[PDB]
């Protein structure tokens, strides 16, 4: 195999000067791009700049994409797909939390970006209730088979599990923990999509994710890379990627 | 004086080649920005492309800024004043309707915008139901009141009466009916905040403002100008801008 995946995902964060250095930061690093996927989500308002300002190994999204008649104000599909945005994030927290998004709007998020030829993160992952009370694959089996079928290219949808604990927080999964999940998603995606399938998706753990602990879960033969939120907003970050070449 | 004001709002539509055109039309009406605003109000990540096209004489401004610590998603005040991004949108309808924006988020993201120095286009209006059951100034009362008091520049925040009914409808708010309205928000703007300032003000009308109906509607005496969806996606919005000039 599987090829690794890094992404960065910039919340509500950056001037024109900060993203200028960072960028600059993470140039300087020599990856094959062939060999390992690098990608960067900035604000919306940022992609140009920040598009302007990556070399060409990293690829770069946007942050949500819309499910109609009445205009939402998110940006569409057919909107990114002809300003040429390669990848669009689904399920992320905040889209869920604070917005009321559904498993079924991720489903649909799911088949407009496909339809208009985007990569979709398609992200899930349990409260830390639901995990104390002992629920978690019961949630992540629930959300995965909300969209899993539609997958038709296995390059082209990754996954990403971070439970809403260890998103902002500090409060990392331990590699144990991420693992047993991601062999569990790996197995959703075997029994409803087929072998070959599951062992091509790409599963990725994000929730403060670090320098000191990217090594210790990337070694975890399902993790297969991160979404990076807090972490990617410092040049450290090319150490990170660096724990997946 | 009043310096009209005649705004374009395009939610979520264009490609990079139908904004060229358009732009490009735009580009071909000669008008003196010290007489007369006129701004274009992109989707987002439009923004730039749609920065680099219009000539100087347009502004231009974005559809919404966020109220953290929470990452919501959305462009902050602060991101905004580091684009050097001149106008915001707060409260039109699709915020309040289909993401739960209140009076006082709206006052909130009044805040945020001044203290940031962006210019603010503020809008309110009434629904159908509130209208058909003689609510309508009533709800506008509240809706005005619930931030106009934070007004400290009266050229730099603009009204937008918009009745819900008259939004993308077709359905235009005959002369009459919008003037009675501007009548009295101009009114509570004395009671709020003086004399001079609301004789300073700009309340402009949106609601399907079309080349048909615009001469008529700027002839009255309290409507300064204009927020135009629909009608602002085509080449024969220069023609509503001269109804201005």
Same mark, same amino acid.
């Given at each position: 195999?599987?090829?690794y ?45 920040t ?21 939402t104000?998110?940006?569409?599909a057919?909107?990114?797909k ?10 992320h ?5 604070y ?8 489903? #649909?998020?799911? =088949?407009?970006?496909? $339809?208009n030829?985007? &990569?979709? +993160? ?13 629920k ?11 969209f899993?079928?539609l ?24 590699? #144990?923990?991420? =693992?047993?999940?991601? $062999?569990e998603?790996? &197995?959703? +995606? ?22 000191e ?11 297969d890379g ?20």
């Open positions: 195999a599987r090829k995946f890094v992404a960065a995902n910039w919340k509500c964060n950056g001037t024109l000067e900060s993203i200028k250095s960072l960028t600059n930061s993470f140039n300087n690093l020599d990856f094959d791009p062939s060999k390992l996927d690098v990608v960067v989500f900035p604000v919306s308002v940022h992609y140009d700049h598009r302007k300002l990556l070399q060409s190994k990293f690829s770069t999204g946007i942050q949500n994409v819309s499910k109609n008649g009445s205009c104000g998110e940006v569409s057919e909107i990114a002809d300003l040429n945005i390669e990848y669009v994030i689904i399920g927290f905040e889209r869920r939390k917005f009321h998004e559904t498993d079924e709007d991720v489903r #649909e998020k799911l =088949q407009a970006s496909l $339809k030829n985007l &990569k979709a +993160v398609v992200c899930f992952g349990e409260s830390l209730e639901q995990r104390e009370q002992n978690t694959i019961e949630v992540i089996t629930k959300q995965v088979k909300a899993v079928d997958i038709d290219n296995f390059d082209n949808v990754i996954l990403v599990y971070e439970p809403l604990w260890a998103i902002g927080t500090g409060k990392t999964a331990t590699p #144990e923990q991420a =693992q047993l999940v991601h $062999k998603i790996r &197995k959703i +995606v075997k029994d409803t999509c087929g072998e070959k399938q599951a062992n091509q998706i790409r599963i990725l753990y994000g929730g403060s994710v670090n320098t602990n990217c090594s210790s879960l990337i070694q975890q033969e399902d993790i991160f979404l990076v939120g807090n972490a990617s907003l410092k040049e450290s970050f090319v150490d990170i990627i660096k724990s997946a070449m």
